[model samples]
Target: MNIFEMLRIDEGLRLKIYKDTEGYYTIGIGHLLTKSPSLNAAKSELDKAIGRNTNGVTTKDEAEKLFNQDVDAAVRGILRNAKLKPVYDSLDAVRRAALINMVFQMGETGVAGFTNSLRMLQQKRWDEAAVNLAKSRWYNQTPNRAKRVITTFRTGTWDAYK
Candidate 1:
């Protein structure tokens, strides 16, 4: 057996390797180039979708009751991984729901460690909150995502995603 046959990689798969780094496969691995949707676009859409919450988790049953959709598993997973204790403990329902959605999209550690936004939120400073949100690296990196998540947080509900 030759080197190509040793690990089972062939000229075909080698030809598909557009880029590789840090042991993670890029576009061309395993026919991913044609098989998966654009990574950035899919992630953005999924992040935004998961952040949207229709009701408060009044109880375990209420939480389950409100979490109804084809993507219920995804929704539940997102909420669980987001670890919404900070938002859950907040007295304001709107703020709780809004932050739960935002953190769900951005993830908890990222949201909690934000230099400005969390401080603004903790202080109840609305103008500063808006400004801080716009200043994030995440905002510049994913403008559409920033806009959608921020809009949803501010507006109470926004179902649109691109």
Candidate 2:
């Protein structure tokens, strides 16, 4: 599968509101409502994710639309990072998606904190990059996801998509 498909598997699609691991109200594919600033606006967006026609839940197509938007958001966020330009451009499809996936989990700023890993990736040091990532606190924060992402970098494949 591709970036979007792998993310859909990782983040998951849901119709109703649920608390994320950090206890923040989230919906769709990891959409953090706290970032909404206005809970009212966030509620409106959730409703809009399904055309406001939902009795209590949204639809698959609408969720997929929201998911795709999130995917684009991460991709755009990755591309906008001028510091990552060369590294991002030099990656293969799977490896690039792995970068996008990291940006997807942690925002550009969070992922940017990985100075050594980014440098390793830029220098085509796959194992070192993976090791650097594995040694981070984020890896402990969400071991499963982080491990899969690390594996992605090391292997250049979506083999750990589970």
Candidate 3:
């Protein structure tokens, strides 16, 4: 299950990903939930409820909550479709993970805007995708994370990026 499921939040409930005063990208649990401690309180709450963090907390009797299971199925389905697999299959583990995380954070429409970058990736145009991937409006707003991911994609190497 994903972090949202671990937090006991329903699949239909949307969370706000906002930057705090310190400029850290934080996950705000709902318009009314207000604030979150960066220590994974939001993640831990639901994770504890299900006795597992990423399905590992198997001992907590209270942790039996399972989500609807089909919230983003359509999106995943599209990615798995034959036509799309050609593009998706070419990505390295780091690139794939980063891309999927991006798709999860941003819906398909927003993710669709990355078509230029995806095209570059499919062409084995690593340098182009590396630079292009970090050109979106979202990346400019979160340079720290974008820079780290871009660096990985660019060099095929992960260095000290924190």
Candidate 4:
């Protein structure tokens, strides 16, 4: 059989969230969700619609395909928000990526509240924007990510921190 067929057999299928051997909540071929605190309303909605969190089931290929669509939709959700759409469309790729990630973490409203930071970004004041971003509650919440984002905002290099 081909690799795809072999992978299909090996990975099997699971649509529902299940407890792994070590007792972690997992779904869609061992994707850990409950342990990782990510804001995925689609997944939550799916779980709610399924009636039970651990009782859903589907093909491996289907689950993976759905995951791809869901992730893209989530990113688009942030970008499409009225306040962020202009920034998303106007910024360079590096800055756009940084903004997208910020919106991902903080939601559009939260990022919108970064008035001084947004002003700096809009004015193309990279260093000032970086400083403004650093002086934020979001930065306080995740120093490592904030550092990376701030460095990128300052340098316009995707891997500036790295």
Candidate 5:
């Protein structure tokens, strides 16, 4: 899948107030607002996102607006990482989408932490790169998600599923 499609699935879109896994009030495509012991910030942000006066609801259009904005941030973030830029530029669109997807989940720094994996990719060591990802806590945290991305790297195709 492309970055947008993959992200919308990885981090679901919520039309109303919902607590995230980290116990934060998040809405509109994973737009995190406030953590535990805080509600004002979340309420204000939610209102602004959905043109709400005082309701916990949002439209798909409004939610998608935030989604595009977040994806743009992730794109810029990936490009801004100087050390990873050349390597990123060398990847195919499918592989590139995988990187941006990872950045969306854990920031550029987090993805850049995959030193060995990045190096393996740089050398076109597809299987090695996949193995490196499998060895990270990221894989363990969300094996399903990580596995999809890893398989893409190993085979250079988005359809490399079980």
Candidate 6:
């Protein structure tokens, strides 16, 4: 067996989310759910070791699959609670993705706090929604990111990084 498998044997497995000794979310052979450039790189290496896709929670490689699944669910929660189904349904996928990204960062409850913004969106007042998006705590905390997301709301395009 390779080093990854050997380490799996050494570290054992964890199927559910739990805290490490120091109290951090970890699963499946100590895959810590903390963010760091180095941590992601290391986890990605481990991801490649077992296979491209493994869904079993009992294995080190499989635990990594939870990331996307959980993220998708969070985004769905955002859309579900936004209560602008008609507005969201009218947008293109790119615009919807932008909104989802915003909801991801701010959370459903946080994004829901944008009452005027959601109202503008529901009314198809794209410019107003964009303006409202800029005037919020989320914007104050993350101006650049808010700008990009708001731009998408304004233009209905996905050019956040550009």
Error of 2 at 24 (Å): 1.3
Q: Where in model 5 is the C-alpha error above 4 Å?
A: 34-37, 48-54, 160-162
For model 1 the local lDDT of residue 116 reads 61
Which stretch of 10 consecutive residues in model 2 shows the poorest summed lDDT? 32-41
TM-score of each: 0.42, 0.86, 0.51, 0.60, 0.85, 0.57
Residue 27 C-alpha lDDT in model 2: 80
The most accurate candidate by lDDT is 5
Q: Model 1: per-residue lDDT, tens digit, 65-118?
A: 323331233234435643444444542554454564444344466766675676
Tens-digit lDDT track for model 2 on 32-91?
Answer: 655544556667656665567454356677677777787888888878887665678999
Instruction: Rank the models by TM-score, top first.
Output: 2, 5, 4, 6, 3, 1
Q: Write the per-residue lDDT of candidate 3 for residues 13-122, one digit (tens) a residue.
A: 32333444344333332111124545455455545434545322222222222222322443475476554456667876655545544544454566666778878878
lDDT, candidate 4, 5-52, per-residue tens: 222332344676665443545566334445533335435744653444
Show where candidate 4 strays beyond 4 Å.
1-46, 49-67
Candidate 5 colliding pairs, count: 0
Q: Write the per-residue lDDT of candidate 6 for residues 9-128, one digit (tens) a residue.
A: 333468754555445445555555554345444345444544553232335336645434445665568557636455567777666766666554555676667777877877778898
Residue 129 alpha-carbon offset, candidate 6, angstroms: 1.2
88 Cα displacement, candidate 6 (Å): 2.3
| Candidate 2 lDDT score at position 63 | 70
Model-by-model lDDT, in order?
Answer: 0.43, 0.79, 0.50, 0.60, 0.80, 0.59
Better of 2 and 5 by TM-score: 2
> Which residues of candidate 2, in runs, are more than 4 Å off?
35-56
